[PDB]
Design a protein around this ligand. Structure first.
Ligand SMILES: C[S@@+](CC[C@H](N)C(=O)[O-])C[C@H]1O[C@@H](n2cnc3c(N)ncnc32)[C@H](O)[C@@H]1O
Length: 287
């Protein structure tokens, strides 16, 4: 995986001198490595809920092991993790939402619709709920709500939910693709820019990982973890996600928005990492 919009992350996070940075979604360690290379005196507390990517990050960040520490914990519990480390506040907070390319291409958890894999989609394999259980057992009306809300399928959510039910029991990513294909007319599939199953897969993933609920709850209080002048930078890839960030930054009384308009990748930043496409970066400062 290649770090998305690393230049803008560094620009807004302002890692310098001996700042302490909380990387809420360390993943394979891409952004963290860039920060450590850019700032020799900084310290990073990196967290993720996926132990498999933390293994990757620990090896990738080897050369900086004395200045970065990794932990398996949800950012919703970052406040107490910091306390157990003797840290009350940090100078920077970074969040890169979504899925790591390794999670997409190498974990065999069915995050992707491109190859046949089990319907798992858990970022934390220790959690109980799987995409398979959700798809095979949730009431049809709830599936419709999820696809409409998290998938943003504003016209076909009910029909996609109906096809999922008609295709039960589902077992692989290809079974889900089949359900979505049967729900969308040929002209609609062709009309779309991204693969037609993209939104439905996203909706199930977000539900399984409580991605929007976690983000909303964390961002409400994130400001309390920042030292004066501290920076919080978030990269979203979902309109509903970006809206939550935008709104949270706006409604905060302790944060001064630094990006009225979302910072987007340059056509070139897109090449250096096609994952950057759909990426919207927002930043704010503790005042
Ligand atoms: C797009 S990836 C991060 C990529 C990373 N910035 C890089 O440069 O390698 C998003 C990450 O957030 C993690 N994640 C998801 N929910 C989380 C949560 N509640 N707390 C912490 N990490 C979480 C995922 O497991 C995934 O590793």
């Amino acid at each position: 995986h290649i770090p998305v919009m690393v230049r803008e992350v560094i620009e807004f996070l302002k890692p310098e001198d001996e700042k302490i940075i909380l990387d809420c979604t360390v993943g394979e360690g891409g952004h963290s490595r860039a920060i450590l290379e850019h700032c020799p005196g900084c310290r990073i507390i990196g967290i993720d809920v996926d132990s498999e990517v933390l293994r990757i990050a620990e090896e990738k960040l080897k050369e900086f092991s004395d200045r970065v520490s990794l932990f398996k914990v949800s950012y919703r519990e970052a406040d107490f993790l910091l306390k157990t480390l003797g840290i009350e506040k940090v100078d920077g907070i970074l969040m890169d939402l979504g899925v790591s390319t390794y999670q997409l291409k190498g974990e065999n958890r069915g995050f992707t619709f491109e190859r046949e894999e089990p319907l798992d989609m858990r970022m934390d394999l220790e959690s109980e709920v799987t995409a398979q259980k959700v798809l095979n057992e949730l009431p049809e009306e709830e599936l419709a709500r999820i696809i409409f809300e998290y998938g943003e399928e504003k016209r076909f959510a009910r029909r996609i939910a109906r096809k999922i039910v008609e295709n039960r029991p589902l077992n692989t990513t290809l079974d889900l693709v089949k359900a979505v294909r049967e729900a969308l007319p040929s002209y609609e599939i062709r009309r779309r820019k991204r693969h037609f199953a993209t939104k439905t897969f996203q909706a199930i993933r977000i539900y399984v990982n409580r991605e929007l609920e976690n983000l909303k709850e964390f961002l409400k209080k994130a400001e309390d973890l920042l030292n004066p002048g501290g920076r919080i930078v978030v990269i979203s890839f979902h309109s509903l996600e970006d809206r939550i960030v935008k709104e949270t930054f706006r409604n905060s009384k302790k944060l001064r928005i630094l990006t009225e308009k979302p910072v987007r990748p340059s056509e070139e930043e897109i090449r250096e990492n096609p994952r950057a496409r759909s990426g919207r970066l927002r930043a704010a400062e503790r005042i």
